[PDB]
Write a protein that binds this ligand. Structure first.
Ligand code: 6CC
Ligand code: ZN
Length: 261
């Protein structure tokens, strides 16, 4: 009756912990995440139009913390999304990442069997209107970006990468230098192509209430920016165990299809 952990991080920690194949909650059901996306097998759906963004361009000073599983920035409902085939507007809650130290294994989703060096999640929750009718398959909207090593610094990512130095231990926080969500995004053309499917959170309690969006095109960071995530973060307060491979094993598609824009 304690923490959960990632496969890698079980043989290094001192509290007892549940490994992925042993996580409880809803983790062991049938509409789980992440998956492999067979790009050819996803039928084009025309209602998957462009996403619209409010608050993404606005400069801000984000609180960012090492929660012992990832590094997370708290977005406090200060940005929002519409479009992308969604039923309603969704308020931005938090953005976090998953990574490895090897280019082929840090992503949670894969595309036609390929895994990327990291994967960025921007977690939104559906807008509470002034109505509500009496297990929502789309309570949460995750925007997901695959990251690969490019040849240049992504200057957009620099206040996040620098703030890594101030939160090495679990339960530490800090404030990033001024920046926008837009700074971390790719240009809008790179945003036109993406995959969609209904799934779960990829960490316990693995609730099956996520409408997923995975953008076909990767973001690029420099190799050394990618590397700062495993070089500066730790899974442990003592700072011996480096935070990496914070990724959930793939889950089966089952009875689901994946569509695309
Ligand atoms: N404290 C922590 N929260 C999460 C979390 C929360 C909500 C979501 Cl939607 C996700 S994920 N990987 O499905 O996008 C992860 C991880 S660690
Ligand atoms: Zn995630």
């Amino acid at each position: 009756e304690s923490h959960w952990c990632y496969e890698v991080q079980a043989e290094s920690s001192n509290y007892p912990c549940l490994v992925p194949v042993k996580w409880g909650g809803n983790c062991q059901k049938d509409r789980q995440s992440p998956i492999n996306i067979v790009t050819t097998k996803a039928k084009v759906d025309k209602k998957l139009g462009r996403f619209f963004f409010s608050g993404y361009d606005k400069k801000q000073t984000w609180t960012v913390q090492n929660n012992g599983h990832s590094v997370m920035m708290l977005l406090e409902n200060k940005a929002s999304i519409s479009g992308g085939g969604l039923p309603a507007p969704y308020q931005a809650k938090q953005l976090h990442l998953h990574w490895s130290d090897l280019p082929y294994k840090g992503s949670e989703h894969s595309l036609d069997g390929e895994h990327f060096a990291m994967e960025m999640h921007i977690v939104h929750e559906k807008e509470k209107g002034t109505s509500r009718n009496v297990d929502p398959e789309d309570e949460i909207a995750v925007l997901a970006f695959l990251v690969e090593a490019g040849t240049q610094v992504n200057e957009g990512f620099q206040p996040l990468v620098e703030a890594l130095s101030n939160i090495p231990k679990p339960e530490m926080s800090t404030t990033m230098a001024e920046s926008s969500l837009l700074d971390l995004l790719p240009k809008e053309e790179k945003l036109r192509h993406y995959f969609r499917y209904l799934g779960s959170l990829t960490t316990p309690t693995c609730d099956e209430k996520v409408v997923w969006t995975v953008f076909r095109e990767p973001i690029q960071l420099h190799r050394e920016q990618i590397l700062a995530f495993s070089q500066k973060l730790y899974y442990d307060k003592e700072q011996t165990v480096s935070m990496k491979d914070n990724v959930r094993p793939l889950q089966q598609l089952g009875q689901r299809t994946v569509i695309k824009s």
